[PDB]
Amino acid sequence: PDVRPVHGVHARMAEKMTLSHKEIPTAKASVEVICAELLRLRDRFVSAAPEITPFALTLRLLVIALKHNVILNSTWVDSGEGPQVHVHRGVHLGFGAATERGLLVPVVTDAQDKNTRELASRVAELITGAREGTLTPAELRGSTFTVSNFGALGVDDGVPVINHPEAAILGLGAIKPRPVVVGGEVVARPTMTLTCVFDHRVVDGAQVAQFMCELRDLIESPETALLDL
Amino acid sequence: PDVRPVHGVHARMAEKMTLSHKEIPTAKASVEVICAELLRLRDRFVSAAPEITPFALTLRLLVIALKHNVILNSTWVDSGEGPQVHVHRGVHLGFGAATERGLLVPVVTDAQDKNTRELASRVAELITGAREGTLTPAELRGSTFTVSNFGALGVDDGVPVINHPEAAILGLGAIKPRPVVVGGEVVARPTMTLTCVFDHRVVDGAQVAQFMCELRDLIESPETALLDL
Amino acid sequence: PDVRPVHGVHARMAEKMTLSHKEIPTAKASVEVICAELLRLRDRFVSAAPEITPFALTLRLLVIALKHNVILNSTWVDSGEGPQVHVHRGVHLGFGAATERGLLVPVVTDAQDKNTRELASRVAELITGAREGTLTPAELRGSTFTVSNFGALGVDDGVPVINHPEAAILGLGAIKPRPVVVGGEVVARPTMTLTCVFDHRVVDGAQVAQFMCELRDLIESPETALLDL
């Protein structure tokens, strides 16, 4: 066989993947989301601000949903005085950026303090930075929740691996036209499947469902929630 | 961070989740099921007996399918004289009931001996009991198979965790109108995705497929199988 | 309980399932594939060569995709000089064949060297051999990649277990008519969901997406790629 020694970003990925597999009892919950209004909103602003993308808007709405479902942004801890869940006050949002040198996971520090435009600009800088290889050590660490946008790569739905010691990860399926029922009629709509993989020690099914339903409802009516645009 | 010590129902969940993750090599099989006839049957009886719900009817049809696919209701055993599968004669059916105090898993003991009406009434008592916190220790133990109804919480499809030492768990996705093809035409129907997660030491793919196909076919033509109504 | 001692093909399955669960940090990626052209191509040749099946054509197109995405056909190795990925030059394609005596996994040795007709004939011999119990030890070993055709058993989508020490497995969902959008219209098409489960130490998300998108595109326009017919 062609023998490839593993180093760098591959070695660390391989390390991080093994740690998660070993420690975290996972479960998964998925919801189908209609993205017509999301893309309409994008169309409204993309000329004046090209960084307002469906991905950026989704991350903004995710931050809102995490502020309302705090248990999703947390860590299981056993060190010391018995079993504890540490619920994090800051949302430091990791997201995958696939590059020539492999995938990197830039982090939006204190995403909870950012308005839609602020978040969109920062995500754009981080996407650019990952691609050009100019990210600092601080921009590649400290996440409390992570997103995997395999949809941008053409995957319809997927099951990503929790970024240890986080309690959950969100996978974003591909946005494309699919058939859905609206007012009893079969119609075409842009849609996507969201899949949350979670540490079932930390988060229960009722909690994940509440989070995902909220996220779906924000994305399906984003204009009011993003009234800071 | 906000530090939450873990006790009670959370602590036991966290314990049960860890045990399953560690021991069970899982695989998953899903089938899409059309629920038009299921809801029609419900409509026929819900006035005189409000406990005949789609969930209750689904559990009844699940019991029938387990009686016909006995390997699904079993336990992997290594204690003693080598590897054994213990196939259980009784179907003691656990199901999730999410409550203020977390999720509980009431159990229908000897579900195999119950007719549709008997099962529906018992499920209703158990749902009430979980909500009001009046379940006995005996009503929270002894399951041989478990159902997770994340569909009632709005989740379209999901991957639940096997309730150790059981061999499989069934997830019930949300029932809602979705597009399907019937006689070559695209039509709206109420549908749901069923997902079975199974111990692949115990159950093989042919066995899970046979079980799930039977369950689908019962749900899609339930009137004859539930001729004890 | 009815106590069943475990031997033979069941015992080895149980062994292989446990090994995979313990070692491999998995992730999963799925794509929906339209199969209209695949079945049209089959119709063209099934009279003169009954072994040209949708399954055989899918495996042929899979081999092509693996030749172009070599990392999918590989093994994680830690023995010796640190972490290595061994990329295999031969594609020795395992596939599930469910039989009276359980499931067997016949192997097409050097599948990369076979033309469409050669592969189709060999797959047919191997299906026959598994059913009649006439396979040699050599025809049941040495795979570098494995396929699980749970679709033939009626399963719409599934999550199979990697055949250790392989880096990935492909699940083939059931081919049937489902609604899809084509040129903005909701239409009926035969479709299937492909699910790849992969060792995330070996393969990254960009690599799996590239593989799966290629496989989808081959299946959706197979006539040119199978111009050796």
XYZ file of C-alpha atoms in Angstrom:
687
model
C 0.000 0.000 0.000
C 0.861 3.724 -0.384
C 1.898 4.571 3.219
C 1.064 8.112 4.332
C 2.491 9.294 7.653
C -0.012 11.533 9.469
C 1.010 15.053 10.755
C -0.246 18.563 11.532
C -3.942 19.304 10.963
C -4.597 15.634 10.011
C -2.856 14.383 13.207
C -4.806 16.780 15.481
C -8.170 15.903 13.684
C -7.343 12.162 14.183
C -6.615 12.969 17.877
C -9.770 15.037 18.413
C -11.983 12.420 16.631
C -10.641 9.615 18.901
C -11.184 11.618 22.103
C -14.839 12.378 21.236
C -15.662 8.736 20.179
C -14.255 7.328 23.384
C -15.933 9.707 25.909
C -19.340 10.922 24.591
C -22.545 8.851 24.497
C -24.254 10.536 21.530
C -27.760 10.751 20.206
C -29.027 12.620 17.144
C -32.137 14.706 16.286
C -32.951 16.110 12.852
C -35.521 18.607 11.532
C -36.395 19.636 8.038
C -36.393 23.436 7.572
C -37.925 25.468 4.728
C -35.408 28.160 3.591
C -37.545 30.332 1.220
C -37.732 33.280 3.618
C -34.065 32.910 4.551
C -33.027 33.270 0.893
C -35.543 36.154 0.406
C -33.959 38.009 3.284
C -30.505 37.357 1.884
C -31.618 38.729 -1.520
C -32.733 41.908 0.220
C -29.233 42.669 1.591
C -26.584 40.856 -0.502
C -25.929 43.777 -2.876
C -24.988 46.288 -0.103
C -23.380 43.655 2.153
C -22.112 40.524 0.329
C -21.234 38.895 3.694
C -24.951 38.412 4.538
C -25.120 34.804 3.346
C -27.585 32.048 4.199
C -24.802 30.459 6.266
C -24.144 33.743 8.166
C -27.866 34.239 8.797
C -28.182 30.620 9.998
C -25.340 31.127 12.474
C -26.961 34.305 13.734
C -30.243 32.506 14.303
C -28.338 29.609 15.925
C -26.787 32.050 18.418
C -30.275 33.324 19.323
C -31.520 29.748 19.806
C -28.465 28.916 22.017
C -29.144 31.998 24.208
C -32.616 30.542 24.741
C -31.492 26.907 25.208
C -28.450 27.286 27.419
C -27.929 23.592 28.122
C -26.868 23.101 24.444
C -23.783 25.265 25.092
C -22.146 23.368 27.904
C -19.653 20.724 29.020
C -19.865 17.483 31.014
C -17.409 17.552 33.943
C -16.458 14.685 36.293
C -13.161 16.067 37.661
C -13.530 16.591 41.435
C -16.835 16.732 43.290
C -19.024 14.269 41.344
C -20.899 14.764 38.029
C -21.496 18.378 36.931
C -22.738 20.182 33.815
C -20.895 23.465 33.221
C -23.186 25.841 31.334
C -21.128 28.476 29.478
C -22.160 32.138 29.514
C -20.322 33.006 26.329
C -21.225 31.470 22.969
C -17.908 30.978 21.204
C -19.057 29.521 17.946
C -16.819 27.134 16.050
C -17.499 26.368 12.426
C -15.811 24.163 9.837
C -13.887 25.809 7.004
C -12.553 23.194 4.514
C -9.253 24.388 2.900
C -6.368 23.120 0.704
C -4.536 22.115 3.911
C -7.559 20.253 5.366
C -10.448 21.451 7.494
C -9.972 24.169 10.074
C -12.424 25.215 12.733
C -12.370 29.013 13.175
C -14.131 30.384 16.244
C -16.386 33.460 16.640
C -15.516 34.511 20.227
C -18.392 36.093 22.126
C -20.836 35.537 19.240
C -23.696 36.328 21.693
C -22.651 39.993 21.801
C -22.714 40.455 18.026
C -25.540 41.832 15.915
C -26.395 40.240 12.576
C -24.059 42.491 10.553
C -21.204 42.159 13.072
C -21.487 38.343 13.038
C -21.713 38.183 9.241
C -18.547 40.352 8.827
C -16.586 38.312 11.363
C -17.619 34.984 9.773
C -16.461 36.337 6.379
C -13.041 37.386 7.839
C -12.685 33.982 9.382
C -13.585 32.173 6.141
C -11.000 34.338 4.296
C -8.416 33.766 7.028
C -8.806 29.984 6.957
C -8.463 29.948 3.155
C -5.394 32.224 3.076
C -3.876 30.542 6.183
C -3.702 33.749 8.262
C -5.734 32.723 11.397
C -4.233 33.285 14.870
C -4.061 30.556 17.536
C -6.823 32.463 19.409
C -9.162 32.256 16.349
C -8.789 28.448 16.290
C -9.621 27.709 19.906
C -12.078 28.140 22.753
C -15.356 27.069 21.104
C -18.365 26.125 23.240
C -20.530 24.936 20.286
C -19.608 23.890 16.738
C -21.280 23.871 13.327
C -20.433 21.587 10.420
C -21.646 22.960 7.105
C -21.369 19.790 5.007
C -24.266 21.194 2.938
C -21.885 23.625 1.240
C -20.024 20.484 0.030
C -23.188 18.942 -1.483
C -24.101 16.540 1.356
C -27.888 16.329 1.935
C -27.659 15.149 5.518
C -24.917 14.015 7.820
C -23.850 13.030 11.287
C -20.802 15.032 12.451
C -18.618 14.332 15.517
C -18.918 16.431 18.646
C -15.941 18.739 19.166
C -14.861 17.566 22.636
C -15.495 18.830 25.459
C -18.589 20.460 23.879
C -22.082 19.025 24.551
C -23.438 19.233 20.958
C -22.652 19.911 17.327
C -24.991 21.094 14.526
C -24.814 19.757 10.979
C -26.274 21.874 8.172
C -27.481 19.841 5.217
C -27.470 21.121 1.638
C -29.992 23.857 0.796
C -31.772 22.993 -2.435
C -35.283 22.731 -3.867
C -37.162 19.758 -2.489
C -40.869 18.871 -2.338
C -42.774 19.869 0.774
C -46.462 20.207 1.727
C -47.668 23.785 2.334
C -51.386 24.338 3.056
C -52.108 20.826 1.885
C -50.473 21.283 -1.540
C -47.205 19.655 -2.680
C -44.864 22.514 -3.648
C -41.199 23.090 -4.386
C -39.192 24.948 -1.739
C -35.525 25.430 -0.911
C -35.008 23.269 2.179
C -32.349 21.848 4.421
C -32.052 19.148 7.083
C -30.494 20.233 10.374
C -28.988 17.454 12.474
C -27.906 17.951 16.065
C -25.607 15.366 17.613
C -25.564 15.699 21.360
C -24.026 14.312 24.542
C -27.002 12.502 26.030
C -25.465 12.755 29.558
C -25.870 16.550 29.301
C -28.864 17.158 27.053
C -32.135 15.206 27.037
C -34.519 14.651 24.132
C -37.021 17.265 25.251
C -34.230 19.848 25.482
C -32.772 19.071 22.042
C -36.286 19.082 20.478
C -37.070 22.468 22.002
C -33.773 23.855 20.677
C -34.217 22.433 17.205
C -37.858 23.444 16.859
C -36.909 27.009 17.884
C -34.048 27.068 15.408
C -36.384 25.797 12.657
C -39.030 28.442 13.489
C -36.422 31.262 13.484
C -35.082 30.191 10.093
C -38.578 29.820 8.610
C -39.548 33.401 9.854
C -36.212 35.216 10.155
C -37.280 38.791 9.314
C -38.629 39.618 12.836
C -35.679 37.964 14.717
C -33.212 39.761 12.490
C -34.900 43.175 12.937
C -31.409 44.518 13.753
C -30.876 44.458 10.005
C -19.529 28.879 33.959
C -22.876 28.159 35.701
C -22.034 24.860 37.486
C -24.941 22.427 37.806
C -24.439 19.365 40.004
C -26.206 16.331 38.505
C -28.683 14.209 40.611
C -31.773 11.986 40.469
C -33.348 11.334 37.059
C -30.536 13.297 35.314
C -27.832 11.262 37.147
C -29.460 7.896 36.288
C -29.997 8.993 32.571
C -26.278 10.032 32.448
C -25.420 6.589 33.941
C -27.656 4.612 31.572
C -26.406 6.580 28.491
C -22.740 5.820 29.387
C -23.389 2.096 29.911
C -25.089 1.717 26.497
C -22.375 3.723 24.582
C -19.588 1.652 26.058
C -21.051 -1.868 25.493
C -23.292 -1.934 22.364
C -22.056 -1.928 18.752
C -25.055 -0.243 17.101
C -26.415 0.016 13.612
C -29.536 1.833 12.414
C -32.327 1.124 9.871
C -35.091 3.552 8.922
C -38.334 3.253 6.927
C -40.793 5.848 5.812
C -44.400 4.965 6.745
C -47.630 6.463 5.372
C -50.036 7.189 8.298
C -53.319 8.062 6.463
C -55.069 4.830 7.446
C -53.691 5.018 10.984
C -55.259 8.465 11.485
C -58.514 7.292 9.777
C -58.763 4.438 12.232
C -58.087 6.784 15.122
C -60.864 9.121 13.885
C -63.252 6.176 13.942
C -62.752 5.537 17.691
C -61.450 8.711 19.398
C -64.893 10.019 20.416
C -65.893 6.876 22.416
C -62.338 6.135 23.608
C -59.999 9.178 23.695
C -57.048 6.907 24.635
C -56.969 5.390 21.106
C -54.217 7.668 19.802
C -51.855 7.234 16.864
C -49.098 6.597 19.419
C -51.188 3.909 21.216
C -52.076 2.246 17.907
C -48.402 2.325 16.841
C -47.362 0.610 20.072
C -50.030 -2.025 19.571
C -48.793 -2.733 16.064
C -45.194 -2.735 17.368
C -46.128 -5.450 19.885
C -47.565 -7.569 17.049
C -44.383 -7.085 14.996
C -42.202 -8.047 18.034
C -44.244 -11.259 18.551
C -43.364 -12.099 14.949
C -39.698 -10.995 15.130
C -38.609 -12.376 18.476
C -34.909 -11.613 18.107
C -35.714 -7.851 18.401
C -36.840 -8.419 22.011
C -33.725 -9.910 23.513
C -30.443 -9.394 25.363
C -26.780 -10.139 24.621
C -25.238 -12.209 27.442
C -21.557 -13.117 27.962
C -21.655 -14.016 31.682
C -20.715 -17.707 32.069
C -20.725 -20.252 29.258
C -19.674 -18.183 26.215
C -21.767 -15.814 24.035
C -25.565 -16.210 24.249
C -28.643 -14.315 23.048
C -31.493 -14.451 25.575
C -34.798 -14.125 23.724
C -37.521 -12.841 26.083
C -40.996 -14.387 26.076
C -42.689 -11.347 27.546
C -42.791 -7.998 25.747
C -42.427 -5.410 28.491
C -42.605 -2.242 26.494
C -40.786 0.850 27.690
C -41.644 4.229 26.264
C -40.362 7.749 26.875
C -42.601 10.224 28.689
C -40.975 13.710 28.871
C -42.074 15.577 32.069
C -41.260 18.715 34.128
C -38.757 16.609 36.115
C -37.068 15.184 32.979
C -37.846 12.130 30.886
C -39.194 8.976 32.468
C -39.547 5.601 30.835
C -42.785 3.907 31.962
C -43.141 0.220 31.138
C -46.173 -1.753 29.869
C -45.552 -5.149 31.545
C -46.763 -8.124 29.530
C -47.847 -5.923 26.599
C -48.125 -9.124 24.478
C -51.192 -10.224 26.458
C -53.101 -6.979 25.920
C -55.693 -6.239 23.261
C -55.727 -2.877 21.495
C -58.118 -1.242 23.990
C -56.303 -2.704 27.019
C -52.930 -1.431 25.735
C -54.318 2.008 24.874
C -55.849 2.420 28.393
C -52.653 1.309 30.122
C -50.470 3.639 28.007
C -52.807 6.534 28.926
C -52.547 5.696 32.689
C -48.809 5.557 32.373
C -48.618 8.893 30.523
C -50.814 10.459 33.260
C -48.749 8.819 36.001
C -45.441 10.087 34.619
C -46.838 13.629 34.331
C -48.352 13.676 37.840
C -45.337 11.815 39.333
C -47.378 8.872 40.677
C -45.599 5.882 38.972
C -44.464 2.914 41.101
C -40.927 1.480 40.967
C -42.421 -1.556 39.142
C -43.868 0.710 36.375
C -40.390 2.165 35.714
C -38.460 -1.062 35.302
C -38.184 -4.397 33.533
C -38.473 -3.344 29.869
C -37.340 -5.698 27.097
C -37.828 -3.148 24.253
C -38.108 0.653 24.289
C -39.739 3.337 22.151
C -38.665 6.965 21.890
C -41.428 9.196 20.572
C -39.344 12.255 19.663
C -41.956 12.930 16.950
C -44.373 14.221 19.588
C -41.675 16.857 20.334
C -41.464 17.976 16.676
C -38.354 16.005 15.625
C -38.637 14.617 12.059
C -36.125 11.834 12.534
C -33.693 10.817 15.209
C -31.247 8.278 16.515
C -32.030 7.288 20.128
C -29.793 5.291 22.509
C -30.511 1.661 23.276
C -31.837 1.132 26.801
C -29.218 -1.342 28.070
C -29.366 -4.490 28.251
C -32.026 -4.384 25.488
C -31.115 -5.363 21.892
C -32.964 -2.515 20.086
C -34.855 0.736 20.435
C -37.452 2.289 18.078
C -37.607 6.005 17.328
C -40.886 7.459 16.053
C -40.438 10.537 13.897
C -42.993 13.341 13.676
C -46.255 12.540 11.867
C -47.074 15.323 9.431
C -48.049 15.844 5.795
C -45.177 15.154 3.440
C -45.004 14.406 -0.296
C -45.033 10.773 -1.350
C -45.645 8.882 -4.616
C -48.854 6.803 -4.721
C -49.756 5.040 -7.996
C -47.185 7.130 -9.798
C -48.639 10.479 -8.667
C -47.015 12.880 -6.170
C -49.539 13.352 -3.341
C -49.670 14.728 0.180
C -49.933 12.188 3.001
C -49.366 12.178 6.748
C -46.109 10.249 7.161
C -43.458 9.365 9.671
C -39.926 7.955 9.662
C -39.323 4.985 11.955
C -35.717 4.412 12.987
C -34.556 1.254 14.718
C -31.194 1.310 16.468
C -30.015 -2.188 17.193
C -27.232 -4.214 18.795
C -25.568 -5.675 15.723
C -24.127 -8.578 17.813
C -27.721 -9.750 18.390
C -29.705 -8.663 15.345
C -28.557 -8.786 11.715
C -29.638 -6.552 8.839
C -32.016 -9.083 7.329
C -33.737 -9.491 10.703
C -34.118 -5.748 11.337
C -35.391 -5.203 7.749
C -37.989 -7.942 8.141
C -39.149 -6.404 11.433
C -39.312 -2.880 10.082
C -41.033 -3.813 6.831
C -43.666 -5.734 8.839
C -44.162 -2.804 11.183
C -44.529 -0.452 8.187
C -47.075 -2.769 6.502
C -49.136 -3.091 9.728
C -49.254 0.681 10.179
C -50.148 1.288 6.520
C -53.065 -1.310 6.742
C -53.966 -1.383 10.444
C -57.714 -2.114 10.239
C -57.327 -5.922 9.735
C -54.553 -6.328 12.402
C -56.590 -4.320 14.871
C -59.802 -6.316 14.239
C -60.046 -6.654 18.044
C -61.366 -3.106 17.939
C -35.829 -16.643 28.423
C -35.115 -18.801 25.327
C -31.287 -19.075 25.539
C -29.506 -19.247 22.182
C -25.792 -20.061 22.199
C -23.974 -18.096 19.477
C -21.692 -19.887 16.895
C -20.317 -19.757 13.345
C -21.359 -16.832 11.133
C -23.293 -15.232 14.049
C -20.240 -15.524 16.374
C -17.845 -13.991 13.799
C -20.392 -11.133 12.987
C -20.689 -10.460 16.780
C -16.842 -10.417 16.922
C -16.404 -8.143 13.896
C -19.155 -5.720 15.115
C -17.441 -5.365 18.544
C -14.000 -4.718 17.025
C -15.313 -1.915 14.765
C -17.371 -0.200 17.572
C -14.411 -0.136 19.910
C -11.731 1.225 17.498
C -13.314 3.528 14.850
C -14.508 7.103 15.454
C -17.229 7.279 12.784
C -19.083 10.013 11.003
C -21.768 9.703 8.325
C -22.643 11.560 5.078
C -25.714 10.903 2.940
C -26.827 12.011 -0.541
C -30.057 11.520 -2.371
C -29.562 10.088 -5.887
C -32.047 10.017 -8.782
C -31.998 6.523 -10.413
C -34.112 7.074 -13.597
C -31.137 6.862 -15.959
C -29.663 3.933 -14.037
C -32.862 1.906 -14.537
C -33.077 3.052 -18.215
C -29.588 1.748 -18.815
C -30.443 -1.509 -17.092
C -33.547 -1.879 -19.312
C -31.313 -1.507 -22.353
C -29.173 -4.560 -21.451
C -31.122 -6.877 -19.102
C -32.538 -9.099 -21.868
C -29.105 -10.078 -23.333
C -27.313 -10.024 -19.957
C -29.588 -10.572 -16.914
C -26.628 -9.913 -14.558
C -26.631 -6.175 -15.445
C -28.687 -5.096 -12.433
C -29.013 -1.702 -10.768
C -26.926 -3.116 -7.908
C -24.185 -4.336 -10.321
C -24.150 -0.986 -12.132
C -23.961 0.861 -8.786
C -20.955 -1.219 -7.736
C -19.271 -0.519 -11.050
C -19.781 3.207 -10.619
C -18.602 2.916 -6.988
C -15.340 1.339 -8.195
C -14.810 4.282 -10.573
C -15.463 6.762 -7.745
C -13.002 4.880 -5.442
C -10.282 5.011 -8.151
C -10.776 8.781 -8.110
C -11.022 9.143 -4.301
C -8.263 6.856 -3.099
C -8.411 7.843 0.563
C -11.835 6.083 0.840
C -10.114 2.730 0.193
C -7.605 2.652 3.001
C -6.737 1.610 6.553
C -5.680 3.443 9.723
C -2.423 1.981 11.090
C -0.720 2.732 14.435
C 1.532 -0.352 14.695
C 5.183 0.798 14.675
C 6.371 4.217 13.546
C 3.507 6.523 14.608
C 0.130 7.165 12.896
C -0.132 6.169 9.213
C -2.880 5.844 6.596
C -2.292 2.897 4.251
C -3.923 3.646 0.899
C -4.657 0.394 -0.976
C -3.909 0.073 -4.692
C -6.384 -2.723 -5.264
C -10.127 -2.270 -4.761
C -11.314 -5.556 -3.294
C -14.985 -4.881 -2.944
C -16.965 -6.578 -0.206
C -20.728 -6.660 -0.355
C -23.423 -8.107 1.893
C -25.355 -11.156 0.706
C -28.123 -12.117 3.203
C -28.753 -15.928 3.160
C -30.622 -18.671 5.092
C -27.482 -19.129 7.232
C -27.116 -15.380 7.963
C -25.330 -12.626 6.083
C -22.117 -13.307 4.218
C -19.782 -10.755 2.730
C -18.413 -11.993 -0.619
C -15.480 -10.066 -2.063
C -14.760 -8.988 -5.672
C -10.929 -9.184 -5.712
C -9.262 -6.636 -7.971
C -12.596 -5.005 -8.887
C -10.596 -2.051 -10.335
C -9.395 -4.225 -13.229
C -12.883 -5.325 -14.272
C -15.073 -3.811 -16.964
C -18.801 -3.377 -16.389
C -19.736 -6.790 -17.833
C -16.895 -8.583 -16.011
C -17.922 -7.024 -12.671
C -21.616 -7.769 -13.219
C -20.888 -11.478 -14.007
C -18.618 -11.872 -10.985
C -21.143 -10.217 -8.629
C -23.823 -12.623 -9.940
C -21.544 -15.679 -9.315
C -20.851 -14.422 -5.847
C -24.547 -13.845 -5.077
C -25.290 -17.406 -6.317
C -22.355 -18.816 -4.350
C -23.429 -17.182 -1.088
C -26.990 -18.484 -1.526
C -25.936 -22.053 -2.395
C -23.115 -22.021 0.218
C -20.314 -22.731 -2.288
C -17.960 -19.718 -1.658
C -14.241 -20.345 -1.025
C -12.347 -18.856 1.939
C -10.605 -16.529 -0.575
C -14.000 -15.159 -1.792
C -14.928 -14.201 1.795
C -11.825 -12.241 2.713
C -9.464 -9.423 1.811
C -11.904 -6.537 1.232
C -10.661 -2.937 1.246
C -14.165 -1.358 1.003
C -17.628 -2.767 1.748
C -21.187 -2.156 0.567
C -24.359 -2.903 2.506
C -27.397 -3.159 0.259
C -30.125 -2.873 2.905
C -32.281 -1.293 0.167
C -32.856 -4.723 -1.371
C -34.439 -5.639 2.012
C -36.844 -2.658 1.927
C -34.906 -0.259 4.196
C -35.107 3.378 2.993
C -31.949 4.526 4.722
C -29.533 3.054 7.191
C -26.281 3.349 9.054
C -24.116 0.222 8.622
C -20.969 -0.695 10.601
C -17.529 -0.319 9.080
C -15.914 -3.657 8.240
C -12.703 -3.309 10.278
C -9.823 -2.427 9.334
C -11.495 -0.617 6.392
C -11.856 3.202 6.428
C -15.473 3.401 5.135
C -18.614 1.500 4.252
C -21.418 2.459 1.816
C -25.090 1.822 2.533
C -27.506 1.666 -0.405
C -31.043 2.671 0.493
C -34.128 1.275 -1.232
C -34.719 2.384 -4.834
C -38.335 3.431 -5.264
C -40.411 6.305 -6.632
C -40.183 9.385 -4.458
C -40.943 13.070 -5.086
C -38.089 15.266 -6.242
C -37.780 18.724 -7.844
C -36.542 18.741 -11.462
C -36.405 22.092 -13.307
C -38.521 23.640 -10.596
C -41.363 21.105 -10.913
C -42.246 18.418 -8.337
C -42.027 15.070 -10.162
C -41.909 11.375 -9.362
C -38.562 9.627 -9.836
C -36.977 6.377 -8.703
C -34.476 7.471 -6.050
C -32.204 6.157 -3.362
C -30.284 7.523 -0.377
C -26.597 6.616 -0.224
C -25.009 6.769 3.218
C -21.270 6.574 3.764
C -20.011 5.800 7.255
C -16.357 6.638 7.566
C -13.388 6.572 9.932
C -12.971 10.268 10.640
C -9.269 9.730 11.575
C -8.650 8.722 7.938
C -11.191 10.616 5.855
C -12.293 14.230 6.336
C -15.634 15.800 5.441
C -14.387 17.451 2.270
C -13.013 14.109 1.062
C -16.207 12.153 1.791
C -18.342 14.902 0.153
C -16.200 14.847 -2.980
C -16.508 11.048 -3.153
C -20.244 11.020 -2.592
C -20.996 13.861 -4.992
C -18.965 12.051 -7.686
C -20.776 8.799 -7.010
C -24.140 10.612 -7.213
C -23.183 12.306 -10.516
C -22.009 8.986 -12.048
C -25.252 7.250 -11.091
C -27.400 10.136 -12.363
C -25.511 10.106 -15.789
C -24.159 6.556 -16.077
C -24.273 6.067 -19.868
C -20.969 7.929 -20.586
C -19.043 6.337 -17.631
C -20.261 2.907 -18.644
C -19.304 3.373 -22.329
C -17.550 -0.019 -22.045
C -21.032 -1.470 -22.378
